[PDB]
Structure formats: C-alpha cells, structure tokens
Design an enzyme around this catalytic site. Structure first.
Site, mmCIF file in Angstrom:
data_model
loop_
_atom_site.group_PDB
_atom_site.id
_atom_site.type_symbol
_atom_site.label_atom_id
_atom_site.label_comp_id
_atom_site.label_asym_id
_atom_site.label_seq_id
_atom_site.Cartn_x
_atom_site.Cartn_y
_atom_site.Cartn_z
ATOM 1 N N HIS A 9 40.153 29.506 33.487
ATOM 2 C CA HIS A 9 40.144 30.390 34.061
ATOM 3 C C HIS A 9 40.289 31.471 33.587
ATOM 4 O O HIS A 9 40.600 32.928 32.919
ATOM 5 C CB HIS A 9 39.238 30.922 35.167
ATOM 6 C CG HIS A 9 38.380 29.867 35.589
ATOM 7 N ND1 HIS A 9 37.360 30.123 36.085
ATOM 8 C CD2 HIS A 9 38.910 28.824 36.420
ATOM 9 C CE1 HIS A 9 36.415 28.322 36.187
ATOM 10 N NE2 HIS A 9 37.514 27.580 36.753
ATOM 11 N N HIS B 228 48.884 35.782 38.016
ATOM 12 C CA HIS B 228 48.059 35.791 36.649
ATOM 13 C C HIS B 228 47.429 36.898 36.555
ATOM 14 O O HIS B 228 47.730 37.673 37.311
ATOM 15 C CB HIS B 228 46.484 34.929 37.133
ATOM 16 C CG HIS B 228 45.819 35.245 38.353
ATOM 17 N ND1 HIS B 228 46.254 35.438 39.269
ATOM 18 C CD2 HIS B 228 44.942 36.089 37.715
ATOM 19 C CE1 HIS B 228 45.430 35.670 40.736
ATOM 20 N NE2 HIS B 228 44.764 36.048 39.160
ATOM 21 N N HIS C 297 43.595 38.772 34.612
ATOM 22 C CA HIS C 297 42.338 39.292 33.473
ATOM 23 C C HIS C 297 42.241 40.102 32.631
ATOM 24 O O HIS C 297 43.084 40.874 32.291
ATOM 25 C CB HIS C 297 41.503 39.496 34.994
ATOM 26 C CG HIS C 297 41.123 39.069 36.194
ATOM 27 N ND1 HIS C 297 40.460 37.597 36.022
ATOM 28 C CD2 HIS C 297 41.873 39.128 37.194
ATOM 29 C CE1 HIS C 297 41.100 37.677 37.461
ATOM 30 N NE2 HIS C 297 41.786 37.769 37.752
ATOM 31 N N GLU D 43 39.473 44.549 36.930
ATOM 32 C CA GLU D 43 38.687 44.171 37.314
ATOM 33 C C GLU D 43 38.603 45.372 38.491
ATOM 34 O O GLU D 43 36.997 45.911 38.944
ATOM 35 C CB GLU D 43 38.942 42.913 38.402
ATOM 36 C CG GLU D 43 39.162 42.182 37.343
ATOM 37 C CD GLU D 43 39.164 40.359 38.472
ATOM 38 O OE1 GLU D 43 39.786 40.120 39.160
ATOM 39 O OE2 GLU D 43 38.433 39.365 38.087
ATOM 40 N N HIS E 283 47.219 39.950 38.814
ATOM 41 C CA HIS E 283 47.784 39.657 40.284
ATOM 42 C C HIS E 283 48.484 38.853 40.493
ATOM 43 O O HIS E 283 48.673 37.457 39.619
ATOM 44 C CB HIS E 283 46.003 39.086 39.977
ATOM 45 C CG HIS E 283 44.936 39.673 40.363
ATOM 46 N ND1 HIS E 283 43.794 39.552 39.994
ATOM 47 C CD2 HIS E 283 45.113 41.732 40.633
ATOM 48 C CE1 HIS E 283 42.554 40.904 40.319
ATOM 49 N NE2 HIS E 283 43.594 41.739 39.929
ATOM 50 N N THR F 110 39.186 37.233 43.829
ATOM 51 C CA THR F 110 37.794 37.956 42.750
ATOM 52 C C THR F 110 37.505 36.838 41.799
ATOM 53 O O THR F 110 36.353 36.948 41.106
ATOM 54 C CB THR F 110 38.524 39.082 42.310
ATOM 55 O OG1 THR F 110 39.431 38.286 41.139
ATOM 56 C CG2 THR F 110 39.267 40.320 42.766
ATOM 57 N N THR F 111 37.881 35.601 42.138
ATOM 58 C CA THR F 111 37.271 33.903 41.329
ATOM 59 C C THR F 111 36.182 34.022 42.936
ATOM 60 O O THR F 111 36.493 34.253 43.896
ATOM 61 C CB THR F 111 37.859 33.420 40.816
ATOM 62 O OG1 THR F 111 39.325 32.925 41.947
ATOM 63 C CG2 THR F 111 38.905 34.038 39.544
HETATM 64 N N1 LIG Z 1 41.448 36.735 41.510
HETATM 65 S S1 LIG Z 1 42.290 36.863 42.512
HETATM 66 O O1 LIG Z 1 41.896 37.379 43.688
HETATM 67 O O2 LIG Z 1 43.791 37.465 42.387
HETATM 68 C C1 LIG Z 1 42.557 35.284 43.107
HETATM 69 C C2 LIG Z 1 43.979 34.680 43.847
HETATM 70 C C3 LIG Z 1 44.135 33.159 44.266
HETATM 71 C C4 LIG Z 1 43.762 32.944 43.542
HETATM 72 C C5 LIG Z 1 43.917 30.759 44.111
HETATM 73 O O3 LIG Z 1 45.063 30.733 43.704
HETATM 74 N N2 LIG Z 1 42.561 30.214 44.536
HETATM 75 C C6 LIG Z 1 41.826 30.639 44.306
HETATM 76 C C7 LIG Z 1 41.795 29.791 46.190
HETATM 77 C C8 LIG Z 1 42.094 28.629 46.546
HETATM 78 C C9 LIG Z 1 41.672 28.390 46.964
HETATM 79 C C10 LIG Z 1 42.153 26.909 48.003
HETATM 80 C C11 LIG Z 1 42.602 25.977 47.112
HETATM 81 C C12 LIG Z 1 42.986 26.328 45.878
HETATM 82 C C13 LIG Z 1 42.820 28.030 45.516
HETATM 83 C C14 LIG Z 1 43.303 28.826 44.136
HETATM 84 C C15 LIG Z 1 42.457 32.820 42.344
HETATM 85 C C16 LIG Z 1 42.150 34.457 42.423
HETATM 86 ZN ZN LIG Z 2 43.028 37.573 39.723
#
Ligand SMILES: NS(=O)(=O)c1ccc(C(=O)N2CCc3ccccc3C2)cc1
Ligand SMILES: [Zn+2]
Length: 258
Positions: free
Chosen positions: A62, A92, A94, A104, A117, A196-197
């Site tokens: 992604h 990361h 976008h 975003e 982010h 946001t994902t």
């Molecule tokens: N685009 S953002 O909103 O900054 C964003 C911030 C963090 C994450 C992220 O590290 N994830 C999603 C939630 C999650 C839940 C459990 C385990 C692992 C994860 C991994 C994805 C997106």
């Molecule tokens: Zn993000």
C-alpha cells in the site's frame, strides 16, 4: 479481493469490509483555513527525535513504512493538543500519479503532491496494538510535500526504494534521522480523526503542519516507480495511494497559530 486503491477495491469500497468507513470521525478531511479556529490554549508541539532508531523499510503493498525501535522512549511527540507521551513507530507517505494530487488532507481544497505521516502511539496503552483501540491512542503528524527544490534529508529514503520495489520486500534502514523531513515551522492544525487506511479505526489525534516541505520532481518520480504487486506479478505502479477527504461531521479543526 482485499482492499487497495483500484476501481474495484479502492476507498469507495472500504465500507463493506470496514463499516466504520462511514463513521463520525473519519480522516482525512479538508482543512478550511477560514473556519479553523485559533486556539490560544494549544501548546507548541514538542518533537524529540534526537535518539530515534530507525531499523527497516518495508513495502507493504500500500505504501512503504520506515520503522523505528519503539521499545523505549526515544523518538517522542508531546505537547501540542496531546496529553502524555507518544512514541514514534513508523512513517510513510501517500502520493499521486501526477504532482496535482496525492495528499490525503487538503487545504481549502488544495491537493499537495504527497503527504508524510509520522505515526506515534500513546505510551499509556503499552503497545501500538492496544493503542489503536482507544480514542486517544495515536498521534499522527502529517506534513505536506510540494514539488520544487530537493529535500536533502529525503534522499536516503529515495535511494533504497529500488531494493523494495515490490510488496513484501524489506531492507535494513538504520540510522535514518527523521528530523531531516521536517519543515522550519511547527505551526499546525489539529482535529480528532481516524486511520486513513483499513481498519479505519477512530483512534487518531491528527496534527497537520501548515508549512509543506519541498521535494524534487526526481524524488517523487522514484516513489512512483514502486509497485503495489508482489515480485513476478503483473506490474501495477504504486501511485494514488491516498484516501479522499471525508465528511467533517461534528468536528472542529483548531489552529495553533493566528
Ligand atoms: N495513514 S495513517 O492513518 O497514518 C496510518 C497509520 C498507521 C497505520 C498502521 O501502522 N497500521 C494500521 C493499523 C494497525 C492495527 C493493528 C496492527 C497493525 C496496524 C498497522 C496505517 C495507517
Ligand atoms: Zn498515512
């Protein structure tokens, strides 16, 4: 048939697997700069990245994540609108297929070329996985990218991307200093929102810096050479991995600056 950014699995489909997509505090949003209220009670943001320990960079299908050792209070965000201490776990970006889109958050409907982010979790919940289950679990620092002059502090990231072209590839990425990705000013907007994902959890205090960083066309072009697909799969360029602005609903955006 999992989620992504295509016609058949992109943002307008996410609600089917993740009904919170249509929730009351979804992100990103448009920041209407005239409606955002200056809040004199907001504190300066405290970004303490001197002891940050980056470990690895990962293409997760992604985006790419630059990961940090978050097993001690090293790289922390505090102050601003936050209560307590939030530890950096990863950053990361976008970005778009063209310079006219990719962010975003938007500012008076303006789309930037990309958005960084820096993701932090509230230490009072012990780990990231517990933090995402809480309304004040995460603090994400968002920084806009515009195309112009190169960002020298970004080049180390750009040059490793060749080694993580495809989904599931990772590479050692030690001693990267995220201070080199920050703009001069820490003036910001803030509001309560979400990831946001998927899973789109409503666990984020958003802090979006007013001042964009500039990156070169060549730098962003290298982001656009990444792949959403795994090695030896049909090539799908990793571009337009942004969720559009969502309804503000019953929220106020606050400004740290006049
Ligand atoms: N685009 S953002 O909103 O900054 C964003 C911030 C963090 C994450 C992220 O590290 N994830 C999603 C939630 C999650 C839940 C459990 C385990 C692992 C994860 C991994 C994805 C997106
Ligand atoms: Zn993000």
């Amino acid at each position: 048939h999992h989620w992504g950014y295509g016609k058949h699995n992109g943002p307008e489909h996410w609600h089917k697997d993740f009904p919170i997509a249509k929730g009351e505090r979804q992100s990103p949003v448009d920041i209407d700069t005239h409606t955002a209220k200056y809040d004199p009670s907001l504190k300066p943001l405290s970004v303490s990245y001197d002891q940050a320990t980056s470990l690895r960079i990962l293409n997760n299908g992604h985006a790419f994540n630059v990961e940090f050792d978050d097993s001690q209070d090293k790289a922390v965000l505090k102050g601003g609108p936050l209560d307590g201490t939030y530890r950096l776990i990863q950053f990361h970006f976008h970005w778009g297929s063209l310079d006219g889109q990719g962010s975003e958050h938007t500012v008076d409907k303006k789309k930037y070329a990309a958005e960084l982010h820096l993701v932090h979790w509230n230490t009072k919940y012990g780990d990231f996985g517990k933090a995402v289950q809480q309304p004040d679990g995460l603090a994400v620092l968002g920084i806009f990218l515009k195309v112009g002059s190169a960002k020298p502090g970004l080049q180390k990231v750009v040059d490793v991307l060749d080694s993580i072209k495809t989904k599931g590839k990772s590479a050692d990425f030690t001693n990267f200093d995220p201070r080199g990705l920050l703009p001069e000013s820490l003036d910001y907007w803030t509001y309560p929102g979400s990831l946001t994902t998927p899973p789109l959890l409503e666990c984020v205090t958003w802090i979006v810096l007013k001042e964009p960083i500039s990156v070169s066309s060549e730098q962003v072009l290298k982001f656009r050479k990444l792949n959403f697909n795994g090695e030896g799969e049909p090539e799908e360029l990793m571009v337009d991995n942004w969720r559009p602005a969502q309804p503000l609903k019953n929220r106020q955006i606050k400004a740290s600056f006049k």
